[PDB]
Amino acid sequence: DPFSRAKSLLKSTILHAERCKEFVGNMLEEYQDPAETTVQSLVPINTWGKSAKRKLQEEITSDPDWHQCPRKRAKMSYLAIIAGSIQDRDKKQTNVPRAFMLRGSQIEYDMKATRGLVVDTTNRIIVGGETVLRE
């Protein structure tokens, strides 16, 4: 199930800094990761990979301690999921989208966490309708 599968991954990364840092580094540099094939099943085939990796690298440069902050983890999780997604080899690479629909579904996934799978109201962080953090 794409929904439940996305929910599991994002909980593991948003709630755990060490796992999020590991996950992000593996997606950015393409090394083994337990969510490798999961990531590929969730994102439609796209041309966004290099853009996502640039974004990831800008963030690490500007704030090394990004993994300390839950809002940043959610954002970097979004970019990392795209960074490890299946790329269309025949098309020009293009800019990452701000949101996309999880593969084979109308489940929206938003980078700024306004809508869909991951929702951040500045009080809670809600993953798949389940509140996982509350300030």
Numbering used by the authors: 547 to 681
Task: Give the original sentences from the paper that presented this experimental model.
Again, despite little significant sequence identity (∼8%) between THOV and IAV in this region of PB2 (although the motif QSLVP at the end of helix α3/4 is conserved), the domains clearly have the same fold. The structure-based multiple sequence alignment of this region of PB2 strongly suggests that DHOV, Jos and Quaranfil have a similar three dimensional structure to THOV, although Quaranfil is more diverged.
Despite very low sequence homologies, all domains have similar folds to those of the corresponding IAV polymerase domains. However, the critical active site residues in the putative cap binding and endonuclease domains are not conserved in THOV and DHOV and, contrary to the case of IAV polymerase, neither domain shows the expected in vitro biochemical activity.
